[PDB]
Design a protein around this ligand. Structure first.
Ligand SMILES: *[C@@H]1O[C@H](CO)[C@@H](O[C@@H]2O[C@H](CO)[C@@H](O[C@@H]3O[C@H](CO)[C@@H](O)[C@H](O)[C@@H]3O)[C@H](O)[C@H]2NC(C)=O)[C@H](O)[C@H]1NC(C)=O
Ligand SMILES: *[C@@H]1O[C@H](CO)[C@@H](O[C@@H]2O[C@H](CO)[C@@H](O)[C@H](O)[C@H]2NC(C)=O)[C@H](O)[C@H]1NC(C)=O
Ligand SMILES: *[C@@H]1O[C@H](CO)[C@@H](O[C@@H]2O[C@H](CO)[C@@H](O)[C@H](O)[C@H]2NC(C)=O)[C@H](O)[C@H]1NC(C)=O
Ligand SMILES: *[C@@H]1O[C@H](CO)[C@@H](O[C@@H]2O[C@H](CO)[C@@H](O)[C@H](O)[C@H]2NC(C)=O)[C@H](O)[C@H]1NC(C)=O
Ligand SMILES: *[C@@H]1O[C@H](CO)[C@@H](O[C@@H]2O[C@H](CO)[C@@H](O)[C@H](O)[C@H]2NC(C)=O)[C@H](O)[C@H]1NC(C)=O
Ligand SMILES: *[C@@H]1O[C@H](CO)[C@@H](O[C@@H]2O[C@H](CO)[C@@H](O)[C@H](O)[C@H]2NC(C)=O)[C@H](O)[C@H]1NC(C)=O
Ligand SMILES: *[C@@H]1O[C@H](CO)[C@@H](O[C@@H]2O[C@H](CO)[C@@H](O)[C@H](O)[C@H]2NC(C)=O)[C@H](O)[C@H]1NC(C)=O
Ligand SMILES: *[C@@H]1O[C@H](CO)[C@@H](O[C@@H]2O[C@H](CO)[C@@H](O)[C@H](O)[C@H]2NC(C)=O)[C@H](O)[C@H]1NC(C)=O
Ligand SMILES: *[C@@H]1O[C@H](CO)[C@@H](O[C@@H]2O[C@H](CO)[C@@H](O)[C@H](O)[C@H]2NC(C)=O)[C@H](O)[C@H]1NC(C)=O
Ligand SMILES: *[C@@H]1O[C@H](CO)[C@@H](O[C@@H]2O[C@H](CO)[C@@H](O)[C@H](O)[C@H]2NC(C)=O)[C@H](O)[C@H]1NC(C)=O
Ligand SMILES: *[C@@H]1O[C@H](CO)[C@@H](O)[C@H](O)[C@H]1NC(C)=O
Ligand SMILES: *[C@@H]1O[C@H](CO)[C@@H](O)[C@H](O)[C@H]1NC(C)=O
Ligand SMILES: *[C@@H]1O[C@H](CO)[C@@H](O)[C@H](O)[C@H]1NC(C)=O
Ligand SMILES: *[C@@H]1O[C@H](CO)[C@@H](O)[C@H](O)[C@H]1NC(C)=O
Ligand SMILES: *[C@@H]1O[C@H](CO)[C@@H](O)[C@H](O)[C@H]1NC(C)=O
Ligand SMILES: *[C@@H]1O[C@H](CO)[C@@H](O)[C@H](O)[C@H]1NC(C)=O
Ligand SMILES: *[C@@H]1O[C@H](CO)[C@@H](O)[C@H](O)[C@H]1NC(C)=O
Ligand SMILES: *[C@@H]1O[C@H](CO)[C@@H](O)[C@H](O)[C@H]1NC(C)=O
Ligand SMILES: *[C@@H]1O[C@H](CO)[C@@H](O)[C@H](O)[C@H]1NC(C)=O
Ligand SMILES: *[C@@H]1O[C@H](CO)[C@@H](O)[C@H](O)[C@H]1NC(C)=O
Ligand SMILES: *[C@@H]1O[C@H](CO)[C@@H](O)[C@H](O)[C@H]1NC(C)=O
Ligand SMILES: *[C@@H]1O[C@H](CO)[C@@H](O)[C@H](O)[C@H]1NC(C)=O
Ligand SMILES: *[C@@H]1O[C@H](CO)[C@@H](O)[C@H](O)[C@H]1NC(C)=O
Ligand SMILES: *[C@@H]1O[C@H](CO)[C@@H](O)[C@H](O)[C@H]1NC(C)=O
Ligand SMILES: *[C@@H]1O[C@H](CO)[C@@H](O)[C@H](O)[C@H]1NC(C)=O
Ligand SMILES: *[C@@H]1O[C@H](CO)[C@@H](O)[C@H](O)[C@H]1NC(C)=O
Ligand SMILES: *[C@@H]1O[C@H](CO)[C@@H](O)[C@H](O)[C@H]1NC(C)=O
Lengths: 431, 122, 122, 122, 433
């Protein structure tokens, strides 16, 4: 027997690499930093071990979604002049949207440096902090200056495909019962992933991909209460947003070529912004979640859903973006139930204009007012739960870390490095 | 035609029919991320071609050498390697014997390089 | 000496004696432009060298192969191909069949790679 | 084992047994500068491998050729070149005759390409 | 005899390339971007022609050190609102006679976190930082040339050793001769993966924290008979120098804008004492005796060697400018170079602190070094000198400096970058069949 060298053997090792974007009005995650797309090959008898919790595509996608966010905010207005003293009065002076607003008057710079401009705007009470018609100031003014969300770029997520470079392959687990870890009997080599919409949300995985046959529970260590549980639905739960107000965006020229878009007036339906989830559909979806959740804790255990414990408004609420305006919904009527072995649910949502999105300090963003009435149709395709540390297990909604949102889309994918040079014995002998 | 990595689960005998399928797929600040991945693929490919060249195997997908198969690396008979195992299983068995084999192939070629160079002057 | 691309208007027979001239000229903000063009020149060169390797033509400029000419790709005889046409005129004629021949050359070498491999086992 | 450039001071005969050591080390503010250093290493390596292929020495470290040694280049005998001189001393002697030798090897192989092309035609 | 082509021959030639960094809280000379390190092969029978005065590693390191400097001063505060009229009085509260009218207690109106509001703040500024305009009205010394970027408070100025490593196809040749004078054939050459840890210590008139000679004091000049060329001395034994800033400065944060803070000297807790450096008198006199001994080999045994203090010029070139602890000292070395040589006690060098720092000799680029809380002590090694000779049987040598490339020429003198030329052709009895 003699050593014979084979070049091109189908052998791969696990690897971490830089996957390039691909996609098929400018966007935050635009197509100017991506590549046009064009595929899937079934690898029979191949049983690969996946790990959705130590996947580097999740860590890289988090970096890239952040990077495309900042890259889309540099070329537009920085609101340094908006740190002035505000003389704010109430809008209603008495349940409505107008009880959430302060009518703030301030001196603003003009396009001519030596001239001022007495203007006013309606600021949400969540954006103004009192100084001790009282005197207020914008909330993120002692920490940073808010680069205005540029009005011509949309926040709508477009699907992005992460494609492996040459010498690498993306392995896709086609198993329908694959939780997040261990062998996957059915594997495929895709050129690159399905369109992953970077939907940014907390406590609820809006839009995205459904499970195939049954609700899937995915935790790094189900016995550890410090680990989030990524529930994935099989049938989506439709959630409808609204801001009933007919907003009136107003433009203020704060400098040469720079405009500040302000809420000048609010008329129309002044009901508080809310989201509606069907009460029958949500009840049967939690029934499926509970059924798949007793498999890890016992048949006789009591599964109780409570509401978020505490913390920032971005972590205690179903924070999300819808129609360019950022909502923060309570979701305390969604998660309120105890499970023993036409109607709708209305979630009161607050709205903010000053956004510190990626759990960072020092880089805020001022989301300008959206003219008109905002309406919203989304699919709740998952959950992020945390368990409380007795025969009763309490599951509060979780979140905060944006990586668990994209870990729910990149759980089935894996990047490998092709090792095409292999040696093996054969009856050969070089002449 | 199975496609790229299609014969990953096939036996070592059947997976060797399609070495050219994997061979051709090893070669082809946001610009730098794409650009640095392209350079990594090129230098990763060239290091494998350089290894084949110094073993006297350049330009060949299947190359026969003059290094006898020491049974310490694997004592399984030829019938239970090319018709029972896959290439992924094989790579895990001779993973620790890979580097010592690589040195032997390098030492076998430069011995043939000088022996043929000497014989060519006669 | 004619120079780079100098024999572009020369007949196919005359232009095939100057292949080394064109072969050596395929390899050699505003910093990535220079850098990304260099990486693309290296990648393109390696793609054509890889193709020659999997056809058994590695390290050769003129490589006679075992693939027969079908005459459905070109019915012209050798006299009117190597003494009347140029390589640009010829390229526009078999452009349709280029990928048909490129597949036959790869398949022929792979069969020839094992027939020689099985011959050494005796 | 001497290491990289270990036989730089050794004689030409002794330093020719360690060509693999130097060969394998020619391939592999801190951003693009480090990235364009890798692309330069690949381009420098690829243009040296291209020269070997043009001279018919692809995939070889010691390549005996057909071009006779013009005594004008170096009148020294083999005994005092391969046993008394080092490669750095030798490179200094023939640094000006390098380019004329390179053209001689380039055309000699081009003659051999057509000579074997005509022999195979029979 | 026929031409035989050999690939991989050990042949090189002089070349210039972009060596990449490697290194074994952020730093100015960022080691996060530098690749981790891992190595040395002795080259018997190899004699190589070195030249430390035409070495391109020094020119490249100067560009890299400057580039790593101003790229670390991009993200942090630009002190353009600090160009205002300061109404400064003198600190006379507990000042020693030496440090009399050297700190000025300057009050000014600053911008607040709120654009429309104003802020009346005070700070202590060194006399070297403020210039009077006609309590008196002063303004910062660099407000008619440029606005000054505050040195970022979390980045560190401490030199971290860096390794300049050659790319593939290049080699770094290291001269292992122990009496190499920087130029000429080095008979003991070795190939290294890349250079030792070269700390980018910025200094003047004294090479601090450098590398010591192996056998004796090494004198290195481009042309020893040319006075216009600086003379680089290298010590075989170090002369430790103890730095100090006795003042207990208090750092005060002034909020000058949204997300921006300006760090101002609040008040010294105690008596005002002058910063100084101590060099052992016995050790320094011993070292100068060794320096003179090897300095007579180029000027004669009967030559009178005289050491004088700096001829004149900028404060950065007339003083032992350096930095340690984050504060930039400008020490007066007229006590180190004062002697004439013919055929327990300590030397105290009164230093002066400065805060607006322009160090790469680039007019238009500042850096405001924020005050360092507490008391600064610092112990370095004087491992060399940068001397200059005056234009008779008496030679006068004065400390030099300014050009920062001489500080790094004293570390990269033994290194050389070569390009491997592996394609060689030689006659042989071969004939291709
Ligand atoms: C020459 O090298 C010496 C040591 O090799 C340098 O002295 C050291 O400088 C660093 C940075 O200033 C000191 O670290 C600091 O220590 C203080 C007190 O422990 C601490 O509060 C700081 O947070 C920081 O960790 C280090 O202690 C000091 N070592 C001594 C004095 O023995 C010296 O600065 C160098 N001189 C140059 C580069 O000019
Ligand atoms: C806008 O600026 C004007 C001045 O240009 C402010 O009016 C002054 O308010 C102060 C009290 O803080 C009075 O002492 C002055 O007499 C006022 N000047 C006038 C009326 O000409 C006004 O308050 C500012 N508006 C804001 C900050 O909303
Ligand atoms: C910026 O100002 C806000 C508002 O004053 C600060 O947040 C407050 O911090 C105090 C002290 O812990 C709390 O009692 C308040 O409830 C906080 N207010 C809000 C709205 O959260 C914040 O700490 C300041 N940031 C900095 C860097 O100074
Ligand atoms: C989830 O997906 C739906 C459907 O794409 C999104 O709703 C669309 O939003 C865009 C932009 O606001 C509108 O132009 C479409 O008309 C909407 N479609 C429907 C059916 O209403 C929704 O915004 C997504 N949810 C997010 C991003 O949280
Ligand atoms: C979210 O909903 C909860 C529940 O409706 C609100 O908080 C509690 O409301 C019940 C009755 O509705 C009270 O008995 C509790 O005292 C409330 N707890 C509080 C106010 O801490 C809550 O106000 C809603 N909104 C938010 C932002 O939590
Ligand atoms: C800081 O600002 C105050 C108020 O503007 C200055 O005090 C005034 O200065 C003007 C100068 O024209 C005098 O006419 C006033 O009498 C001063 N007092 C008041 C109450 O206005 C002060 O001089 C400024 N400080 C600095 C360092 O410029
Ligand atoms: C910026 O201002 C400084 C301070 O006046 C100038 O430096 C002075 O130049 C005069 C010459 O007219 C000298 O007499 C002074 O001694 C200098 N001051 C110091 C502290 O040395 C400097 O020239 C000015 N620079 C520019 C570009 O205008
Ligand atoms: C430098 O040396 C001086 C003395 O020349 C030191 O000052 C003395 O410090 C000691 C304490 O160790 C006191 O007892 C003396 O009274 C001081 N003398 C004078 C004249 O001040 C000084 O501390 C040294 N500085 C260092 C070592 O950094
Ligand atoms: C260089 O040394 C000379 C002499 O030691 C310094 O000049 C004199 O120093 C004395 C010290 O007491 C002063 O009283 C004189 O006024 C100085 N003379 C002049 C003309 O200034 C000189 O200052 C030193 N220079 C440096 C850069 O150290
Ligand atoms: C000053 O130089 C001395 C002498 O080189 C240094 O002390 C020696 O450092 C070497 C290198 O690590 C050690 O091997 C020796 O054991 C040390 N000797 C002693 C007596 O400690 C010293 O570290 C240098 N100081 C500074 C601050 O650079
Ligand atoms: C403004 O509204 C707040 C909260 O709604 C209330 O506490 C305050 O009294 C109001 N100010 C008035 C009515 O002047
Ligand atoms: C996920 O499934 C695999 C295979 O069934 C199993 O080994 C693993 O334990 C599961 N994950 C957890 C957290 O139990
Ligand atoms: C939510 O339901 C309420 C009644 O329950 C209705 O008035 C409101 O219009 C609904 N909003 C949306 C967005 O469906
Ligand atoms: C959401 O709105 C759609 C129409 O946009 C409607 O058909 C559906 O019934 C609504 N569902 C809920 C839960 O409000
Ligand atoms: C959760 O609900 C309780 C009452 O049920 C409420 O007091 C608390 O504020 C809620 N926490 C949230 C919404 O984060
Ligand atoms: C929700 O999902 C359904 C299919 O499950 C789809 O038809 C509908 O358009 C989705 N709604 C969205 C994305 O708003
Ligand atoms: C998987 O194994 C079966 C027999 O066990 C074989 O027929 C099939 O070809 C294998 N898969 C591939 C892709 O070769
Ligand atoms: C095979 O390898 C072993 C080491 O595991 C060695 O002892 C033995 O001599 C080798 N057989 C040979 C060289 O024939
Ligand atoms: C062009 O054609 C003529 C004859 O038609 C031929 O002599 C000449 O060599 C050709 N040009 C080149 C560059 O070969
Ligand atoms: C030539 O090509 C045709 C299809 O275009 C094919 O049918 C025929 O068999 C080929 N000729 C030969 C000799 O294979
Ligand atoms: C250096 O030259 C001497 C001269 O005979 C030789 O013996 C020795 O082996 C040489 N060293 C190397 C490393 O070749
Ligand atoms: C040998 O070289 C000389 C010049 O050194 C040249 O004139 C002569 O023609 C060459 N001979 C051959 C056969 O190439
Ligand atoms: C401070 O003292 C110095 C030196 O005595 C003097 O020149 C200056 O005028 C004094 N300034 C003030 C404001 O008293
Ligand atoms: C500077 O003046 C301020 C005035 O409030 C005083 O508090 C401070 O102590 C003074 N500093 C010194 C040491 O002169
Ligand atoms: C350095 O040494 C070389 C070789 O001995 C000599 O040629 C040169 O003049 C010396 N340089 C100085 C400045 O002495
Ligand atoms: C410097 O301080 C050290 C202690 O850190 C001491 O051992 C040494 O003697 C001092 N050198 C002087 C004062 O010259
Ligand atoms: C430095 O000290 C010496 C001696 O004390 C003195 O002559 C000289 O003037 C001082 N330097 C300056 C700039 O005053």
């Amino acid at each position: 027997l003699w050593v014979t060298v084979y070049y091109g053997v189908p052998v791969w090792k696990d690897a971490e690499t830089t996957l390039f974007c691909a996609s098929d009005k400018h966007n935050v995650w635009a197509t100017h930093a991506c590549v046009p797309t064009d595929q899937e090959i079934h690898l029979e008898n191949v049983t690969e071990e996946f790990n959705m919790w130590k996947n580097n595509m999740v860590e890289q996608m988090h970096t890239d979604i952040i990077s495309l966010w900042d890259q889309s905010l540099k070329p537009c207005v920085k609101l340094t002049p908006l740190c002035v003293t505000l003389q704010c009065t109430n809008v209603t002076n008495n349940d409505d949207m107008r009880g959430e607003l302060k009518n703030c008057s301030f001196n603003m710079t003009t396009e001519l440096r030596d001239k001022k401009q007495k203007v006013y705007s309606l600021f949400y009470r969540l954006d103004v902090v009192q100084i001790n018609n009282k005197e207020y100031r914008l909330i993120n003014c002692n920490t940073s200056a808010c680069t205005q969300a540029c009005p011509k770029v949309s926040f709508e997520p477009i699907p992005i495909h992460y494609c492996a470079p040459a010498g690498f392959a993306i392995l896709k687990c086609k198993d329908k019962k694959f939780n997040g870890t261990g062998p996957c009997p059915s594997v495929s080599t895709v050129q690159c992933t399905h369109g992953i919409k970077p939907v940014v949300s907390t406590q609820l995985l809006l839009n995205g991909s459904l499970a195939e046959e049954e609700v899937m529970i995915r935790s790094e260590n189900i016995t550890n209460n410090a680990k989030n549980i990524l529930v994935q639905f099989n049938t989506p739960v439709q959630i409808n947003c609204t801001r009933p107000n007919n907003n009136t965006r107003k433009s203020i020229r704060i400098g040469p070529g720079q405009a500040f878009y302000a809420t000048g007036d609010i008329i129309g339906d002044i009901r508080q912004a809310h989201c509606n989830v069907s009460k029958a559909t949500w009840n049967e979806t939690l029934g499926k979640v509970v059924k798949q959740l007793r498999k890890h804790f016992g048949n006789n255990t009591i599964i109780r859903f409570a509401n978020s414990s505490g913390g920032d408004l971005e972590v205690t609420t179903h924070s999300f973006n819808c129609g360019g305006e950022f909502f923060y919904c309570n979701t305390s009527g969604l998660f309120n139930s105890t499970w023993i072995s036409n109607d709708s649910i209305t979630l009161p949502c607050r709205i903010k204009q000053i956004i510190n999105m990626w759990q960072r300090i020092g880089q805020c963003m001022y989301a300008p007012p959206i003219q008109g009435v905002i309406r919203c149709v989304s699919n709740i395709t998952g959950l992020i739960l945390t368990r409380d540390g007795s025969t009763t297990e309490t599951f509060r909604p979780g979140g905060g870390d944006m990586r668990d949102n994209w870990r729910s889309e990149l759980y089935k994918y894996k990047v490998v490095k092709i090792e095409p040079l292999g040696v093996a014995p054969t009856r050969c002998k070089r002449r | 035609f199975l496609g790229f990595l299609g014969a990953a689960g096939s036996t070592m005998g059947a997976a060797s029919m399609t070495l050219t399928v994997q061979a051709r797929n090893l070669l082809s600040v946001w610009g730098i991320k794409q650009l640095q991945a392209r350079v990594l693929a090129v230098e990763r490919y060239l290091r494998d071609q350089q290894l084949l060249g110094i073993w006297g195997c350049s330009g060949k997908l299947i190359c026969c050498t003059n290094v006898p198969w020491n049974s310490s690396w694997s004592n399984r008979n030829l019938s239970e390697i090319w018709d029972n195992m896959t290439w992924l299983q094989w790579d895990k068995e001779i993973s620790n014997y890979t580097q010592i084999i690589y040195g032997l192939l390098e030492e076998s070629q430069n011995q043939q390089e000088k022996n043929e160079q000497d014989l060519l002057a006669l």
